[PDB]
Amino acid sequence: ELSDPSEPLTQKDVIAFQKEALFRCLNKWRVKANQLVEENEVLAAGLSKTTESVSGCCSSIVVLARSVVEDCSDEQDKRFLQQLINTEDEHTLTQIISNNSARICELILKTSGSNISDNIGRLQELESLTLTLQKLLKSSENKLKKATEYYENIIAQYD
Amino acid sequence: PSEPLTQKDVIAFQKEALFRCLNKWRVKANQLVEENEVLAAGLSKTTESVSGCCSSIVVLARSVVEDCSDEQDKRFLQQLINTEDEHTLTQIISNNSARICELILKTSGSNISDNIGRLQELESLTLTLQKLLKSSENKLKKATEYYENIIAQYDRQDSESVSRVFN
Amino acid sequence: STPARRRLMRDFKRMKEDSPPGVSASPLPDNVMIWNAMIIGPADTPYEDGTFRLLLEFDEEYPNKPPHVKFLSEMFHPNVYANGEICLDILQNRWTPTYDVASILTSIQSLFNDPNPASPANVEAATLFQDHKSQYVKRVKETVEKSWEDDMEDMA
């Protein structure tokens, strides 16, 4: 704590200003980094809940496949449905289903005796995007809430 | 400690230790940007693959709800079809997969939905949700910059050294 | 006692009595023809809180000749050459005898606030100021942290 406001600056004053200046630069990264830690918790949590949540959608589609392979006419379609049933890896299963959901739906509707609506490949494409953009919207809104809450407690400390 | 907790604490630290603290946080911050970019990308790719798996069940519902026998079942399937929340879907699908599977196989119906009318609705929603995403993402950038700019001013307000130099 | 050496001593009394905000300077205890000067970067400039040291060289033609002024710290600025010399109009051709130490340094200090394009000393700096302001600021923020390590022994 050294000043003399009218007197010219001293070596003791510039070191005390360089130290404080270091802190200001330091706190900028500390704050910027700690919020990025906060986001990684937000991201990592959403990664696990999203992966966990698909187990209901995947298993119920395997159910529909098993009831349909027995009464399938095409052998190419019987093989593809057996691939679904015998994959035994939800991450692989989910990719097989999502990439071939158009084909899969058609096979269940044809075999179980329903009228495959035309324009059904575009129906699934727009349904998956709507659901995705909804999840992405909500996540960025939580990113805003969690970031706002993060900074607000920091401002609260100053006052 | 090893880190200057408060600006008042900086007098006790040498320059070399401060430079070390500065570069450690700079690096941790720059590394977390790389990590968050990669994770955020993986979240959407995971989200796309999960929405693809579930939406195919919603498709199977829409093609059969028109021809359902029970009013108890038409209500249940319309709730399934009209829930724009993927987290809700996954719970509806997982908790009621038995009923849902039975309904798709048993109550097998026709093609009488407005095949072109719902495609148009989903096209306007996708385009809308795309604009709302971009807007909510800029709100994040502007908030990060806003709060960081505010916190930075506090450090200069509470700085006795800046007060000495630029009084 | 010569006209130059006497006028310079007045500038030192100027710096001693009313030193401009963010600036200090002093001649060598054994030579008044060389001064150690230091400019603190003003607020809301990418050169903020930077403690940049300079070196001023005078001859016996002062104040009728502008001193040869060049930086001692690593500087990233479109107006500052790689050898430390500065492209400031006041120094080169706008020299007016009413400029003392105090005004020369705040003038340089003010080059941080709003720089002067079409004076390309560091083309890297001049172009990056127009094309990639982020990368310009990233390089300046580096010269600011590197300025802080000196310990300013030239001030005692």
Numbering used by the authors:
A (entry chain C): 12 to 170
B (entry chain D): 16 to 182
C (entry chain A): 2 to 157
Study text:
In the budding yeast, the H2Bub1 reaction is catalyzed by the E3 enzyme Bre1 together with the E2 enzyme Rad6. In addition to the RING domain, Bre1 contains a N-terminal Rad6-binding domain (RBD) that also makes important contributions to the H2Bub1 catalysis.
We screened through several fungal species and were able to crystallize the Kluyveromyces lactis Rad6 (KlRad6) in complex with the Kluyveromyces lactis Bre1 (KlBre1) N-terminal fragment 1-206 or 1-184 (crystal forms 1 and 2, respectively). The structures were refined to resolutions of 3.2 and 3.05 Å. The structures indicate that two KlBre1 N-terminal polypeptides dimerize to form an elongated RBD that binds to one KlRad6 molecule. Our structure indicates that KlRad6 interacts with the N-terminal region of KlBre1 RBD polypeptide 1 and N- and C-terminal regions of KlBre1 RBD polypeptide 2, which come together to form a single Rad6-binding site at one end of the RBD. The interface buries 2000 Å2 of surface area and contains hydrophobic, salt bridge and hydrogen bonding interactions. When the three KlRad6 molecules not mediating extensive crystal packing interactions in our structures are compared, large structural differences are observed for residues 90–98 and 115–121 surrounding KlRad6’s active site. The temperature factors of these regions are also elevated in this structure, but less significantly.
